[PDB]
Amino acid sequence: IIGGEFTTIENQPWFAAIYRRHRGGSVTYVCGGSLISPCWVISATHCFIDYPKKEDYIVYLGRSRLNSNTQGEMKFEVENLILHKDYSADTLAHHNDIALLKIRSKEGRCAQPSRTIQTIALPSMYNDPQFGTSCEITGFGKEQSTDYLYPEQLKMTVVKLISHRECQQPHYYGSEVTTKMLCAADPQWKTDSCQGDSGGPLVCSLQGRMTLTGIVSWGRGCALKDKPGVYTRVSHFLPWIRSHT
Ligand SMILES: COc1ncc(-c2nc(C(=O)NC(=N)N)c(N)nc2N2CCCCCC2)cn1
Numbered sequence: 001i002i003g004g005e006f007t008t009i010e011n012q013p014w015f016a017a018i019y020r021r022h023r024g025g026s027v028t029y030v031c032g033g034s035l036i037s038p039c040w041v042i043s044a045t046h047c048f049i050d051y052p053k054k055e056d057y058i059v060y061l062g063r064s065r066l067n068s069n070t071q072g073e074m075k076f077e078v079e080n081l082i083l084h085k086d087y088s089a090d091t092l093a094h095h096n097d098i099a100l101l102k103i104r105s106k107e108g109r110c111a112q113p114s115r116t117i118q119t120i121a122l123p124s125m126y127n128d129p130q131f132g133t134s135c136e137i138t139g140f141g142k143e144q145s146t147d148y149l150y151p152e153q154l155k156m157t158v159v160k161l162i163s164h165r166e167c168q169q170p171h172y173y174g175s176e177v178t179t180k181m182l183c184a185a186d187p188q189w190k191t192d193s194c195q196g197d198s199g200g201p202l203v204c205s206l207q208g209r210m211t212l213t214g215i216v217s218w219g220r221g222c223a224l225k226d227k228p229g230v231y232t233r234v235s236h237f238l239p240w241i242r243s244h245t
Helices: 234-243
Strands: 015-021 027-037 040-043 057-061 074-083 099-104 134-139 155-162 181-185 201-206 209-218 229-233
Touching: 015 040, 027 057, 027 209, 040 209, 057 099, 134 209, 181 209, 209 234, 229 234
Parallel strands: none
Antiparallel strands: 015 027, 015 057, 027 040, 040 099, 057 074, 074 099, 134 155, 134 201, 155 181, 181 229, 201 209, 209 229
């Protein structure tokens, strides 16, 4: 996350942390995710396509830190990895950039909800918030685009939604953005998502309850003028989600 503020998992308990085994014992961070249901985490597809085998992957919950074991956390293996059949990578864009992970532990159980671990609700269909709505992104992504490293502590920030009409501008993303994608940004372009945040949530409060409006997907440089963050428009993928569960 570019700018923003640090946080713990108690502020964003649905947040999930996805790591991949090696290939010689090493365990590196891959992407974020959101627990939508006890056995189901949702992520982005582009996160896994290079190494799309579930046995490679580990998923932790109730984890506020990157390489340090947070108290109250739970570790999970991927029982099933479900990438979106119609996915495609444009040079910049990622189409249908949405993934489902079925989680289970070594004891073969899903999550137990705790103070540090809780599900996020999904929108009602096609029911997105008004543009300019302040909305919340979370992840262990780069603090600045020049950084090699990801931050050790979890971060979150605020971004305001942008109408499609607006994001369609050639000045912005031109053609690249579709209506299954959302844009968001800080009016100053001061804070943003970045690499490593991908798969992580975009949670707007809608109808007096918090709601998973988007999944961090792509962007040209973290936090640059006239280049918002682009997120998978979750309201648009509800049947796919529903079915694949
Ligand atoms: C040159 O610097 C630079 N570094 C990283 C990225 C990048 N950004 C995002 C991202 O979420 N961006 C955003 N919300 N603005 C994102 N989700 N993924 C990113 N990448 C991940 C590595 C694979 C190649 C694409 C870049 C772009 N530019």
